[PDB]
Amino acid sequence: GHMRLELPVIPLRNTVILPHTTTPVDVGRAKSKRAVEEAMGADRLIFLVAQRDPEVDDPAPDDLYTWGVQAVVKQAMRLPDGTLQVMVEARARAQVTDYIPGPYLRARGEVFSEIFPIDEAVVRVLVEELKEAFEKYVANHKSLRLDRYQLEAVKGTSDPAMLADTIAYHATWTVAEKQEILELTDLEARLKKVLGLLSRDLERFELDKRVA
């Protein structure tokens, strides 16, 4: 089973947040600011969930993907425009299913841990494959540029779940693609999916290089 938490929800217009990342979320909507205030009132805990359609201004629960993350609001400060900049530390995958009627989005959702890697030796091999593929991916990417610290961090990650999520964070993949990664709670399947996307992209980059 999984812990079930009742938290406010921030709907993300066109981004997917992965666990093991700390990122700024700029929110302009009143209901989103309300959700942040409510999360501050109860240990900073919040759910973040991508919208299916970035154009929806006041999403119903149904307008949001099922999978998101449970996070901690580490900081929230106003920018010069009304904008609230929220620093979110994403901690865990969440299946955010059961919403509560009210003046902002609030839901009960199941939060997932990682469990011990099951086939440990297979997972260790996939970790090595992922690190090698990621180095090539960044080296051959025509738009994405990581500094030495970001690359070092991926190479130096020994936690397979953190590795896969960090790669997925950096990679230029669509909302749908990152949602597919979020929903893979099985570690081996998640590692293989991320490896698969990297490998496909490496082949695509070679094709784009030829045709240009």
Residue numbers in the entry: -1 to 210
Give verbatim excerpts from the published study on this entry.
The Lon AAA+ protease (LonA) is a ubiquitous ATP-dependent proteolytic machine, which selectively degrades damaged proteins or native proteins carrying exposed motifs (degrons). LonA belongs to the AAA+ (ATPases associated with various cellular activities) superfamily and contains an N-terminal domain (NTD), a middle ATPase domain with conserved Walker motifs for ATP hydrolysis, and a C-terminal protease domain (CTD) with a serine-lysine catalytic dyad in the active site. Substrate recognition of LonA is thought to be mediated by its NTD. Collectively, our results showed that the NTD of LonA selectively interacts with protein substrates via critical hydrophobic residues of its N-lobe, demonstrating that the NTD enables LonA to perform protein quality control by selectively interacting with proteins in damaged or unfolded states.
Based on the result, we also crystallized and solved the structure of the longer N-terminal fragment NN291. The structure of NN291, refined to 1.7 Å resolution, is very similar to that of NN206 except for a longer C-terminal helix by four more residues, that is, residues 207–210. Despite the lack of spontaneous proteolytic fragmentation in the crystals, no electron density was seen past residue A210. (D) The refined 2Fo-Fc electron density map around the C-terminal residue A210 of NN291, contoured at 1.0 σ. Nonetheless, NN243 exhibited extra intense and poorly dispersed cross-peaks around 7.5–8.5 ppm along the proton dimension that is indicative of a highly disordered peptide segment, which most likely corresponds to the C-terminal extension of NN243. Together, our crystallographic and NMR analyses suggest that the NTD of MtaLonA forms a bilobal globular structure (residues 1–206) followed by a C-terminal flexible extension (residues 211–243). Our crystallographic results of NN206 and NN291 are consistent with previous findings that the ~40 residue region between the NTD and ATPase–Protease domains is structurally flexible with multiple accessible protease sites. We further applied multidimensional heteronuclear NMR experiments to assign the observed cross-peaks in 1H–15N TROSY-HSQC spectrum of NN206 (BMRB code: 50697) and the NMR-derived secondary structure of NN206, based on the Chemical Shift Index, was highly similar to its solved X-ray structures. Together, these results suggested that in a MtaLonA complex, each of the six NTDs may connect to the hexameric core by a flexible ~40-residue linker.
